[PDB]
């Protein structure tokens, strides 16, 4: 998503449904490459602590003035006719200047945005339709004409453009929780295993205290911990170096 060769243009924004994986947002937030990292659901630091049902990654190119509009509750041709976030957007907007990557020397014209629409689009809609626009009362029975403008016009991206008319890539991480089990979790920190010493142990959620020792027990390929007559834990299997 972040290192793709060619992004979608804003009218036709790509979505990737990130799920069944561990999401190391520390790689993202520590990156010197980003201009903007606006998180609306939670504070950016805590993203490695959370877990979600899915993380939709919406990707598109817009102008460096328009990146601001991607924030929730914004008014403007990108926020209204191309890509709209809901008032309770529980996610992050991430953006970077890609002028040296998306500005052909004589100008690039591959990226289109909708300048015109009969109504603002609803949150997370996408409108691929090229249907000629009804800008004038006269019905647009033609393929082109006065007041029959093509809704999709194209950006002006040139290397010598100002910050504002240089292309910004954007990705919006829409994180969601549903009634389904959360599968997009963060990377769980794992500090060194120490032995013959009284220590606080957290083995896959199992908070406890005790002296850890190398066991002579032999569990089954499926077992991960053990208990005693009292239904109290007395043995656990190391999740990284299986012992």
């Amino acid at each position: 998503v972040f290192n793709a060769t060619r992004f979608a243009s804003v009218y036709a924004w790509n979505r990737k449904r990130i799920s069944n994986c561990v999401a190391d947002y520390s790689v993202l937030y520590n990156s010197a490459s980003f201009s903007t990292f606006k998180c609306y659901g939670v504070s950016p630091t805590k993203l490695n602590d959370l877990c979600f049902t899915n993380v939709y990654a919406d990707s598109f190119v817009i102008r460096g003035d328009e990146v601001r509009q991607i924030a929730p509750g914004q008014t403007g041709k990108i926020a209204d006719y191309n890509y709209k976030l809901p008032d309770d957007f529980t996610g992050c907007v991430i953006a970077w200047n890609s002028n040296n990557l998306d500005s052909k020397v004589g100008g690039n014209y591959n990226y289109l945005y909708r300048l015109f629409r009969k109504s603002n689009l609803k949150p997370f809609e996408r409108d691929i339709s090229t249907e000629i626009y009804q800008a004038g009362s006269t019905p647009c029975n033609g393929v082109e004409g006065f007041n029959c403008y093509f809704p999709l016009q194209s950006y002006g991206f040139q290397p010598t453009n100002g910050v504002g008319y240089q292309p910004y890539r954007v990705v919006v991480l829409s994180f969601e929780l549903l009634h389904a089990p959360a599968t997009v979790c963060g990377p769980k920190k794992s500090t060194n295993l120490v032995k013959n010493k009284c220590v606080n142990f957290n083995f896959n959620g199992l908070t406890g205290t005790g002296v850890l020792t190398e066991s002579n027990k032999k569990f089954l390929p499926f077992q991960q911990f053990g208990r005693d007559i009292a239904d109290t834990t007395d043995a656990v299997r190391d999740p990284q170096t299986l012992e």
């Epitope: 009969k118 800008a135 019905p139 006065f146």
Partner: antibody, heavy 119, light 106 residues
């Protein structure tokens, strides 16, 4: 108030041009198209053409395209019609109008403008 | 490409029914508007989109599509409504109008 402050009654001797304004108000000027009409003292009204004040694009009746020229100025928020080489064909009550797709089509009209070309 | 208004002038008492017609030689797909002109220069829209009206204007106007014909019909005359009437055909460029019809006292 969708008013239309146009130019008052006007005269010039033939073989000469003219200047005709239509100021518009009560709306954001680039949200609507502008068109024009020529109504003679005796003969019917006809459509001269229009300008979209947003996109600076234009369209005309083929008959008038060769003698009309429509313009706007955004900072003045005003429409402006020029007549080039006026003669015995070029005299009427001229009228400005406003248009859109969502129901506001040719509803309100400038008080017109006397463009007599007689001596 | 213009449609034709049946009569050039029409005369009435107050109260009498008044029908105004703008026939069509080609299909305008129902894109048409009715306009009111006073002999002293006052222009204002009556009807659009065939049947849509009732906007800052006397409630009596009606203009439902009559097949091959486009229409205006009124539930009374009035002092100001003794005036000129015009149909606008905008379905296509170039725009055109009917020749107009004048409504008068007897």
């Amino acid at each position: 108030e969708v008013q239309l402050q146009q130019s008052g009654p006007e005269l010039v001797k033939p073989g000469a041009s003219v200047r005709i304004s239509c100021k518009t108000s009560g709306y954001t000027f680039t949200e609507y198209s502008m068109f024009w009409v020529k109504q003679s003292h005796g003969q019917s009204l006809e459509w001269i053409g229009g300008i979209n004040p947003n996109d600076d694009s234009t369209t005309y009746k083929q008959n008038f395209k060769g003698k009309a020229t429509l313009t706007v100025d955004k900072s003045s928020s005003t429409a402006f019609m020029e007549l080039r080489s006026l003669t015995s064909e070029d005299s009427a009550v001229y009228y400005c109008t406003r248009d859109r797709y969502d129901g506001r089509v040719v509803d309100f009209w400038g008080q017109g403008t006397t463009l007599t070309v007689s001596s | 490409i213009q449609m034709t208004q049946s009569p050039s002038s029409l005369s009435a008492s107050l109260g009498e029914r008044v029908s105004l017609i703008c026939r069509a030689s080609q299909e305008i797909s129902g894109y048409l508007s009715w306009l009111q002109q006073k002999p002293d220069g006052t222009i204002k829209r009556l009807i659009y989109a065939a049947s849509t009206l009732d906007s800052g204007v006397p409630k009596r106007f009606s203009g439902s599509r009559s097949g091959s014909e486009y229409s205006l019909t009124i539930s009374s005359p009035e002092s100001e409504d003794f005036a000129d009437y015009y149909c606008l055909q905008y379905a296509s460029y170039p725009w055109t109008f009917g020749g107009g019809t004048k409504l008068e006292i007897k």
